[PDB]
């Protein structure tokens, strides 16, 4: 259950997106364009949640010309973010949970 799981893993609340994951997505574009197999030029990242570990996981809810999807990036506490994982064919308005 994404729900049971999104508590498990201790997501906080749904943030506004931001300066500090806007520039995590921008260190990890070419592998969301690899993922998303879309041209992401014009990607908004719309909101997020996050998951205290070594470092942060960020869940970010982002809108392409293909429609919405849900990120998975790690960034560390030193060191640039990677993509772990996507949620492709989200609706806008779809709860972020934990993959």
């Known amino acids: 259950?994404?729900?049971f799981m999104t508590?498990?893993?201790?997501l906080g609340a749904t943030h506004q997106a931001?300066?500090?994951?806007?520039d995590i997505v921008?260190?990890?574009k070419?592998?969301?364009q690899s993922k998303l197999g879309t041209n992401?030029?014009?990607?908004?990242?719309?909101?997020?949640?996050?998951?205290?570990?070594?470092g942060?996981?960020?869940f970010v809810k982002v809108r392409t010309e293909n429609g919405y999807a849900h990120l998975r990036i790690y960034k560390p506490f030193s060191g640039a973010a990677s993509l772990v994982?996507?949620?492709?064919?989200?609706?806008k308005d779809d709860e972020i949970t934990y993959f």
């Open 1 to 3: 259950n994404p729900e």
């Open 7 to 10: 508590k498990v893993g201790g």
């Open 18 to 22: 931001d300066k500090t994951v806007e």
């Open 26 to 28: 921008n260190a990890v």
């Open 30 to 32: 070419p592998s969301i």
């Open 40 to 54: 992401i030029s014009n990607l908004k990242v719309i909101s997020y949640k996050t998951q205290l570990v070594n």
């Open 56 to 58: 942060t996981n960020y």
């Open 85 to 91: 994982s996507v949620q492709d064919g989200k609706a």
